[PDB]
Design a protein around this ligand. Sequence first.
Ligand SMILES: Oc1ccc(-c2c[nH]nc2-c2ccc(O)cc2)cc1
Length: 299
Amino acid sequence: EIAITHHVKEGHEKADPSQFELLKVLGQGSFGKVFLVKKISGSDARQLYAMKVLKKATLKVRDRVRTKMERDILVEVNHPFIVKLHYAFQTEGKLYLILDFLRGGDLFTRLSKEVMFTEEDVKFYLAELALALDHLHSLGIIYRDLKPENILLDEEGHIKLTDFGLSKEGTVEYMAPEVVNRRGHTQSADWWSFGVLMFEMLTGTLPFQGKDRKETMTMILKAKLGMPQFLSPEAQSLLRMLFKRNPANRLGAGPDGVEEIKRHSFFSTIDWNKLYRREIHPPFKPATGRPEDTFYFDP
Ligand SMILES: Oc1ccc(-c2c[nH]nc2-c2ccc(O)cc2)cc1
């Protein structure tokens, strides 16, 4: 309901600490700290959100100005398969970002537990991801580190790409040959990482992995991809089209971008309009902390 209203306006709203109730810390990492918070007043009163807290000392100083790019990169990001920045505010030493709260964990947790995903699951996750990447692309934003940990699941099983790897147009194993050649991260490199993620979900392994950085680097540049034979011809075709060393030949890098991906035989069963509208039932429904799916019953 609040989503339709945010679709007509750009950016986050103003807020302050008094409008949030803190429940718990969801996590801590090199990024900062994430809290589970509840909105107290206004139209979204009682709504749960994830509050990410950043220390200002970590923030980049450019032309004598301490920048807040973690807040500003999200100004125009507004898609169903990407986290939305709802509010942002500062204290003397911190930057606070209020984002969506996702209950179903991340794709890293699911992949580690299940080892590998079926082509059905991969087709679903990748289709939703292609729409998210295409949304960022139309904004001149690319994704550095498109790994399973950066994709969250909601209680229904729909994806939400996190804002962690967002950057204006990192793990070496996910880097495209042109990025290894220090040519800069373009939308075409995103499609290479899309293929690396595709390979990892389907195999539980990384396509180019060496004994040290040099070998991984040289393998990304020169190694022929080892094609797994348990994969369908459509899946194999998508992988060889995404793993083209020359970015100009890579699927999704053509004149019609994402349309090349959507048109691919691997996604022939995907109704892109129903997928966008979340009318496609996710093939996996994750476990949540919610009592309905944790309590045992003897009716
Ligand atoms: O370690 C964690 C990572 C992510 C979550 C989480 C759960 N729902 N939403 C988020 C989220 C946090 C920060 C963001 O920048 C975007 C999204 C929790 C713990």
